[PDB]
């Protein structure tokens, strides 16, 4: 379910693989087409998530990303709280936070949120 | 630094290895003493801080919890999103979000916000 | 004449000191006002431009910048060469190529070519 | 990988110190073993060129040469723009610009371009 490619609405990608641990291991891409805006990713997700009084509820998962690789380091990380939903219609919708180094004066303004919901599609087109 | 043991101000703890690749990997305990409260820990750390319009600067960082182990499973997962500062105070300054899964119906309050500060020492008392 | 802060025509800025010696020193700014896109900047120019077949004429002069700095790795290095202009119209005229890094098979894209023109001030409005 | 004496394939040569701050330093010399012919040269190099998306690339560098010494003033600067392969066969594969002052009418004309290709070796023989 979990496990695959998912698409933000507004230009990233991330590939993740959910492990039989509840482990999530991956790369985000924050601009897809783009091999050089990609960052590794790794989280955890409710590796069973049936529920009686429940039925039908979506599965529990986070993900963090610090924005460094070879050609980037934003001095920030994002991490996103959210749950997968299956089926025709599947999608991780989430929030985030995202935290930047800052100093002690500027803590009070080092963290933003926002929220980004991921489909296994999104509309594509020939070059 | 970041590598070692944190306490937060409400009776948790966790244990983090910061590795050089910028990896977060431990345990985190919501019950300090309580060997069956202890879950996976995974995330991110920028390993570059440093910063030459910003000296002084904390180190950004994220990571996740499932809340699902041998003993419990509450079908969710926190994510912090925040900042080191090291010194004689060092401290771990978060904010974080627990999504737990949730009806479509329910989705609209299926993630909850909060804060932790995180310290390398609490006050602690012989037994 | 060349020291101070010159203005590409596309949001770009540098500071640079010509030393007596015919050394460029400085820093370039990718994007004005952007603190996390300063580069270290570096060159030299004729330190005795005066000629007596040619009067009037321009000072030639070359600077590198390496696009590393501790926010971001572009992996590549330009260069400026051209000549300043004095007078109420100062300018810099300068072409420039970027070079980046490539493996063998993709040398002969390596290096971009184009040109800037650098002037003392720019169209600028308050806040 | 840097450090070192480089040939070009027409009689010159220049020795450079690239350091650890990504500055490159030293003296061209465009008629080797012409102790006239020495000129300062400053320029900037990718001081970390590996990259996850293109293992194997080359070092982007540029450096500046004014052609201005105790015996010559050519009233114009060169500025290289290229990478470092190492290996074998070390190679620093360039481009050039070459901007002459010049009056305003000739500005036109002010800028050769070319190529070089420097080693670490070049035929040489005994005297």
Chains 1, 2, 3, 4 share one sequence.
């Not at 990608?13 to 805006?37: C, K, P």
């Not at 924005?67 to 991780?92: D, F, L, M």
């Not at 803590?107 to 949120?113: C, E, G, I, P, Q």
Request: aromatic share 12%; hydrophobic share 30%.
């Amino acid at each position: 379910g979990i496990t695959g490619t998912w698409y933000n609405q507004l230009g990233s990608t991330f590939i993740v693989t959910a492990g039989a641990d509840g482990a999530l291991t991956g790369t985000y891409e924050s601009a897809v087409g783009n091999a050089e805006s990609r960052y590794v990713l790794t989280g955890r997700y409710d590796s069973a998530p049936g529920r009686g009084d429940s039925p039908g509820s979506g599965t529990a998962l986070g993900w963090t990303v610090a924005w460094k690789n070879n050609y980037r380091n934003a001095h920030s990380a994002t991490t996103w709280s959210g749950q997968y939903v299956g089926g025709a219609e599947a999608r991780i919708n989430t929030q985030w936070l995202l935290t930047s180094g800052t100093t002690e004066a500027n803590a009070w303004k080092s963290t933003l949120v926002g929220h980004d919901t991921f489909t296994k599609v999104k509309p594509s087109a020939a070059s």
